[PDB]
Amino acid sequence: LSEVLLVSAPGKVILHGEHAVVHGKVALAVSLNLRTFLRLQPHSNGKVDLSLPNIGIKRAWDVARLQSLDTSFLVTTPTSEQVEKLKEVAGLPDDCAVTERLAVLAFLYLYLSICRKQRALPSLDIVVWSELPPGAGLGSSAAYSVCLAAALLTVCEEIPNPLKDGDCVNRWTKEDLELINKWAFQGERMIHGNPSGVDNAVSTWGGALRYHQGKISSLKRSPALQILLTNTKVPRNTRALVAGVRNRLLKFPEIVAPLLTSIDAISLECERVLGEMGEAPAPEQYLVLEELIDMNQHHLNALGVGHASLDQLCQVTRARGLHSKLTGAGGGGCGITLLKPGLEQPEVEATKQALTSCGFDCLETSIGAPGVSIHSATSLDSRVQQALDG
């Protein structure tokens, strides 16, 4: 019971698979509970305005001015004609920051695509703030595109509001989520040429996703694991990192091929343990988990995609009985560390602090969390809506 909408979706990280999948292997994409939020509210004032505090940008549009356009030019929906016209509607000042130019065109594209079937363009105050470190291959984009999706579907009533009962959170039905997915994926294409769809799927469905040769599959429910996201703030060129492995594979086939196969076996095994774990996470299960992380990390190193920072990330953590492994392109970026139950909270804090006393960013979150959701504008942290208010 509420016209005002509060939706959130998680970003994504690769647990196992990093560079193997590019070669026919199995990757395991999990949701990173470093959630992104969207506050949607219908106004009487004929104006649609977008506020993204995280980036410090705010834009608005005269609903009247938008309704005017014969926005009928709306499968490969991303058209040169479309994107072009959309920029006209946009109003992005000539020389404009790349980041917000994409943030706005994804909004407009979606606003106009869904509010399209609406007898009249609604006037709403949009605000999106995220917990997700921007530009670290964490999927902050699709978390966004997923929220602007779920929210806009709910408003236009193309999809029902699942909160309708009296909880603090709730999720759409299986059918609606698919609609939410197909839509977000669209903005994603509106921005990232030819994305795979792993990021939106993760943000939409949450939990664990399996990625093979072009296809995606959800994993049998397995509880969310507590981790430690670590950013080494060390820049890196994903495209280059992926070429280094392609070249290293051509040069050393009889050597790398098997290596890939061992990574593959790792995802397979992790998948197994996750599943069987779903039930009662027994110590052996975590052991096995830390065990897989070590091997994957070293394998990734053998592929020559590791880095001084990561070796440090892994060393500082290992000295304390915790295991870490880079996630993503490698060569810097972020890493993952697994916290199993039992470990004294402070010692989890100390480890957190050590990583920071390196010039590293280290947030304690969880992996394999819920997925796109909606909340009662009274729950969550206070520093959250404050960032969505102030």
Q: What residue numbers does the annotated binding site for Mg(2+) cover?
A: 141, 188
- Listed in sequence order, the DSSP H helices in the chain are 63-68, 80-90, 98-114, 140-155, 174-191, 198-205, 238-251, 253-278, 283-302, 308-318, 345-356, 382-387
Contacts of residue 204, Cβ cutoff 8 Å, sequence gap at least 6 = 9, 146, 177, 180, 181, 184, 371, 372
Query: What residues form DSSP beta bridges with 61?
Result: 48
Residue-wise DSSP of 53-113: TTTTEEEEEEHHHHHHS-TT-------HHHHHHHHHHH---SS--HHHHHHHHHHHHHHHH
For the chain, what's the residue count?
390
Positions annotated as catalytic residues are 141, 199
Question: After what residues is the chain interrupted, C–N > 2.5 A?
Answer: 74
Amino acid letter for position 298 = H
Q: What residue numbers does the annotated binding site for ATP cover?
A: 12, 54, 130, 135-141
Backbone angles phi, psi at 88, to 5 degrees: -65, -50
CB 366 within 8 A of CB 33: yes
Give dist(CA 217, CA 28) in Å, integer.
10
CB 204 within 8 A of CB 183: no
